[PDB]
Assembly symmetry: D3
Homo-oligomer: 287 residues x 6
Amino acid sequence: DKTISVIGMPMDLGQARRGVDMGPSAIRYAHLIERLSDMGYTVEDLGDIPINELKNLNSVLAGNEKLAQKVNKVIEEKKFPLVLGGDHSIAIGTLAGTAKHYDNLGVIWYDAHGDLNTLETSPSGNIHGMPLAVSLGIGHESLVNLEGYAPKIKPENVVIIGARSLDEGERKYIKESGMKVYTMHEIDRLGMTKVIEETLDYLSACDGVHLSLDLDGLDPNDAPGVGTPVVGGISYRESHLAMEMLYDAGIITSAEFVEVNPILDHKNKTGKTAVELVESLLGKKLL
Amino acid sequence: KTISVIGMPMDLGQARRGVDMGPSAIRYAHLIERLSDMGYTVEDLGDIPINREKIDEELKNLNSVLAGNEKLAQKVNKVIEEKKFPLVLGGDHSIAIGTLAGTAKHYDNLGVIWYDAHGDLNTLETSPSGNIHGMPLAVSLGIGHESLVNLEGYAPKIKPENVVIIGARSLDEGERKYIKESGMKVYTMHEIDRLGMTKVIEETLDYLSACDGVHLSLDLDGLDPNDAPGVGTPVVGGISYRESHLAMEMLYDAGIITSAEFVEVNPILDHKNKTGKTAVELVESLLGKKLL
Amino acid sequence: DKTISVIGMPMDLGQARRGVDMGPSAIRYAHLIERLSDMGYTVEDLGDIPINREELKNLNSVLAGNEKLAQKVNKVIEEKKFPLVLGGDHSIAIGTLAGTAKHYDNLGVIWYDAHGDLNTLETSPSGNIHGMPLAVSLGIGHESLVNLEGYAPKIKPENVVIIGARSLDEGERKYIKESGMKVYTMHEIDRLGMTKVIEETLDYLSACDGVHLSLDLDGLDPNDAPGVGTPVVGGISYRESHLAMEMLYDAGIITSAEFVEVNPILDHKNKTGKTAVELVESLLGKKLL
Amino acid sequence: AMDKTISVIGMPMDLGQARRGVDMGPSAIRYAHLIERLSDMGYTVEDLGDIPINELKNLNSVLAGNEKLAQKVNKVIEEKKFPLVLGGDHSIAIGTLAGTAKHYDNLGVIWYDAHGDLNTLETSPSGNIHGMPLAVSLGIGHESLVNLEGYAPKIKPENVVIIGARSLDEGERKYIKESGMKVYTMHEIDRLGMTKVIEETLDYLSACDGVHLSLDLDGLDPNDAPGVGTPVVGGISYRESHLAMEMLYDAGIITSAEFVEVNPILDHKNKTGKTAVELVESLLGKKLL
Amino acid sequence: NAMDKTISVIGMPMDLGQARRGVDMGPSAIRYAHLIERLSDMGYTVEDLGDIPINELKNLNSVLAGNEKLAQKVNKVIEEKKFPLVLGGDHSIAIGTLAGTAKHYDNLGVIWYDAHGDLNTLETSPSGNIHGMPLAVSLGIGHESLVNLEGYAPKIKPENVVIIGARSLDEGERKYIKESGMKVYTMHEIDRLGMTKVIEETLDYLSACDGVHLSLDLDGLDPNDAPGVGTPVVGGISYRESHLAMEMLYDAGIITSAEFVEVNPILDHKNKTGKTAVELVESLLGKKLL
Amino acid sequence: KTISVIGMPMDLGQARRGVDMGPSAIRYAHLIERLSDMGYTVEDLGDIPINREDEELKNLNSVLAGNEKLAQKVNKVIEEKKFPLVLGGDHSIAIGTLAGTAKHYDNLGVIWYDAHGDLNTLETSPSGNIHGMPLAVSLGIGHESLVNLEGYAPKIKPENVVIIGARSLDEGERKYIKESGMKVYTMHEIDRLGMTKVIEETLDYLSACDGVHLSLDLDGLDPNDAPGVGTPVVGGISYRESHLAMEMLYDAGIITSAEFVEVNPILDHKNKTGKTAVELVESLLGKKLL
Ligand SMILES: [Cl-]
Ligand SMILES: [Cl-]
Ligand SMILES: [Cl-]
Ligand SMILES: [Cl-]
Ligand SMILES: [Cl-]
Ligand SMILES: [Cl-]
Ligand SMILES: [Cl-]
Ligand SMILES: [Cl-]
Ligand SMILES: [Cl-]
Ligand SMILES: [Cl-]
Ligand SMILES: [Mg+2]
Ligand SMILES: [Mg+2]
Ligand SMILES: [Mg+2]
Ligand SMILES: [Mg+2]
Ligand SMILES: [Mg+2]
Ligand SMILES: [Mg+2]
Ligand SMILES: [Mg+2]
Ligand SMILES: [Mg+2]
Ligand SMILES: [Mg+2]
Ligand SMILES: [Mg+2]
Ligand SMILES: [Mg+2]
Ligand SMILES: [Mg+2]
Ligand code: NA
Ligand code: NA
Ligand code: NA
């Protein structure tokens, strides 16, 4: 019944551009709005938020401030926030506008990367490799304290699915924090059905759950158009099943689909995949 | 049994999709030689001629589809009367109308394994195109245009309780309502992902255990476009080559398949005949080829 | 040493989207600003003009974006700066010429495109305004488009040279023959060679006091520029285009330019965005030696 | 303006040592809208469908198919219609020329092909009849092929112009030099340019009362025509071929034509079938303006 | 579990047989994917010994000469208590690798990860390609000079072999597998059991071996994941299944030598297969995603 | 005159580019069989071994050692009145080829067919890559050990060089070309004059030379025709223009040595570039279409 509020974040910042600012346009090009309207939802496209050691800190901070304020307003209006990226640093703004509305927000971090870096552990200084750490209260003070509170989330309320690119500092933190992580090894061993059932078990006491889906979580064969492709990822079929299972559980209260990069895509295969996954997450069925 | 190969170079509907070249591409991948090497007697009955007609219409190319399907039903009937195995090559999926018209009257309870991205359960009322290749399963169930439903003077050819759809991922609202109303057994990609192809085939064999014959209607578009790019209407997120190969080996071991058609191969979207070669590999597995 | 003022137009309007709103981002991704600075130019990136998303398709959004573009191009010229517009669909030529033409007594236009874009609603099988900007700029078409910025026509038919045409409908052909417009289709380029085509173009426009280059990347062959809104087979090569830009720089006649219709959806690793930057570099004086 | 009805005949023939996929050529050319495009140009078009196709490889089948083709082509010429034959392997030129040559006092032939197809069983490394049709038509080869339709030879060596040759064996080279046959290899196309090659071809065949074009898509470079039976690197470009067809149309000398050797197996989304249709359109008078 | 051994890398740029297949460029392409730097970053001491010069049975003399040099180099690496990692090159190089390795173990196990069984003799081979015969040769079946390389035979026993990924076996190879009782996981068994169970069963089956050699042919993987191989065969093992199998073999601590063979840049796409070979070596040597 | 083929599997510099596999890919396209079929006596001398090993000049010791071995082998071929045909490999091998060749002529001419001028020194090079310096080194400008290879300098004079296909020249290279008066046909001049006129002018310009070396970098061709090169540069010479140029050089009878370098199988499409190199060598040695 909730209206879907779509917010685009054409952010492509860091040591070098990767082409992900074009992600929102490519997702819309795959008919996102019409597909959600056809499913019976009231859809409001709020358009794109304007975007200008720690690369581009001021621009990352300003865009995330605008995103946090817009996501906060959507939640206050009892609407579902759907954010399109854009580099994964936008999770800083999305979680800042969302977490204060829940006593115990869960986060499903669907990505090849853990994005748990600080400037001390990052081989690049890229803020898009730090948003999960920042949201857990670890990192640059201005990013950690966005919107005047911290931390946004607790490590026991995070589940990472699809991880296959973690540096030494990120691995040390996951082990020390006891964070729940399904690397490609456990997806291969358990199967996506059991990974999602266990993820739903794990986050069962959360009063809201945010899905932060990076298209780079999928294998480059299925999602070639991403900012930083990593070999050996989740299939389209496994991702489609996961979105169907999340819809059936009724636990997802916010979501962002990020890192779509038309420069490396093939005739918008990745933009189309993002829309198919959003449709499944919002209740579309094959029968 | 001797294998009787029948080609149907049919590519009809609102627009061509390139599938009339399917039979040629499957033969190019050495279908006849491969079956002969496995020890079968193989008869290539060649291609049935498909009537060309001028280039609005409600049912697209109706006259040419009925005519081609009448020629096919008569040839398939003759093959079965001779106790030979009919292997039909397509061609658009509307050829299932003629294959089932020539086959179903030889059984009291013919089962059908519909291996396809599409349910092909449309009528003109539910079809946004009038494409008869989107209606053959409905026609064979006795639902649709009178001349198509009554082909060979009997209807219906099959009963809904004797159909299993495997790989479905593109169904319109009219097809979904019919599947739910009829109680038809359908394994969408969601069920294949959750159960695994081994369980899907085991359940299919149990479900059709009261049939006296089973027809396999295999649309190469049931496979994912990564494995079968050369199809008339590709749909993302399909069955892998390995799952399809295992399915054919399991169907061979069960010994239930009494007829088969391999359809919708389209050389225009194919990569160096990957899909024609895949069709031959799947036919070899269905007919008993083993890796060891 | 004239400052280059870059304006992005992320416009993708018409019966259906074609992905050309991402053109400005792709051209900038190929380092346009850094390449022009390295050549010794002062470069001012004025950013992207905001465009509203989707008979005359998207008339209100096409008019609104072109109004913003026209007054921005006007200011650049009033400041004695070179306007470089990045597209975006070719309908943005309506705004570029509206902001430029009033500054010249006889503005020349080199329309480098597979399409003539000489349609009206009466000759257009789609109602797409991006297939009408040259006709609109010549004073033929919808009143609100033709009278943008309060004057019409922007240009005269004797001051236009079309180069690379290979997709002209019957209405466009009829107008070309009746107006006596100078057109070098791919047949003339094949027969004369690009050197002769550009020498004849410079001679034909020699009396113009300014010359605008409207370069649609679809003028190039899809093998060289696959990433365009509407690709048409059998186009101009990269080498022919590179030579043309070098000859135009040497003539010193180009006073404004737009590079339009870049489409990342059909591109291969930004080959077309990179090509756009190389052609801009050559037009602005980059030499191989 | 050719006020003649076009008669399209398909020859889905793929014979020889091994199949090459060219039997699918006629279907792929029709898939690229051949009939609709010619009708939209104002021609009356009749699709006569495909002739059924059941040491010298497959001699009986090549003979049977060419006999049916010769009879059909003969009927079209008797009806004062233009025969347009779609292949299929190049051996179909035996039947096309058998049905055509007897209607002319001095039939010219433009053989547009990477191959000369001037082999006999003695000079052929394969025994493929599709590498022998020009020799057979000149009265050199197997008696049943040479005597098809009860007359021989169909054509005289001084009435042949080969364009695009780049795969000639020593027997073919010896015959070309001894006969004095006019051949424009890729070397001569590189040195002269296509305009001059076609102007010279028109001068050379000006005394012929009819001219047959036998266009093998393998004459084009595999970059432009990847979907052919036997691709050979370094061929004619799409633009050179488009210009050549426009110039043949302008001369008004072409009285029959065949477009052969399209092979979907090696093609990319029917680029070669589409190219065949574009070349037919230009040969029949389509202009860009 | 931590292998405190130096890795000795040996390249074998061998591409012999009825026709070249491009696999001599395999070692260069694997090195181009940063093999040495990746193993060094994991904390291993790595010594690149470079490439061995490769100067009816196709090219028998050249196959023998190259395998003789390889066997002597592998033997010296094992005498030095280092881990031999051989890069191919055609699969005939397994003859030299096993000749230099088998004499150092009482019961050497072999995991043959390949679309092909390579169990041919001249009698069962339609080509005479020695690269289709190295497993038979190593079992003591074949041409005397190949079987007796380094003066002993057989190198391995049939009960100590596990073939994983087989999908191209001729009639002579099938007959031998059934008569010898050799353990073979065809793609049909992988589809039915899943790679986890296949590797668990493999480890149990080879538990009495005192060393285990992995002979990994990149053609064992599906051509969609490993297009750049000498002889691609449709319907192979996925990159993910192969990555899981290498991780499981590392956890078992049984692999004592390994060869990665048949990488072919001619059919590859921007070195996807050379990169895949490096990732599989990294997992085999203990790299973990977490 | 016998053709002596020498391979240089050298891929040195700041980063590898895959060109060490160039000689193997060219041979894979049947180079030796094609030249033998044309009636030539052909001797394949094999590949020179390249020593395996932040410095200013990248891999200097290995580049010098390889070029010393190449110069001695090329010198021997010329002393035997044989035609040296060198396969690369990175373009730094021109240092060794010209060192072994230039001393046999009064005034050696050089046709430098390349997207790059390769006229850098360490001071003008943003990488320290010696493969961007071989023409300057051979003109006697650069590092002492490279310039003095084989005990004489310079190998060639600037008035005896013609560059064809240039489209990537840095400021230091442009300044030297203008100050030395060197003859350079950039893509602009090829587009304006046509390849027939370019080669006719080149033949007239080098008519006083008693020998002419062709240094052909496949990157001189457009990446659409030669995708498999070490450093591709958009807007290059077509295969057809290059084929015509080779036929014209054969007819002139002036080419007394040649090298075909920078083939990179990693970026190639089913050896399109290796096959293109063989076709160009065939035309340079007299192959005709009729
Ligand atoms: Cl049809
Ligand atoms: Cl109906
Ligand atoms: Cl079910
Ligand atoms: Cl789907
Ligand atoms: Cl097959
Ligand atoms: Cl003969
Ligand atoms: Cl043997
Ligand atoms: Cl080194
Ligand atoms: Cl220096
Ligand atoms: Cl070759
Ligand atoms: Mg991320
Ligand atoms: Mg990521
Ligand atoms: Mg179907
Ligand atoms: Mg279907
Ligand atoms: Mg335009
Ligand atoms: Mg245009
Ligand atoms: Mg021919
Ligand atoms: Mg030919
Ligand atoms: Mg093997
Ligand atoms: Mg193998
Ligand atoms: Mg160079
Ligand atoms: Mg170079
Ligand atoms: Na792309
Ligand atoms: Na294809
Ligand atoms: Na490749």
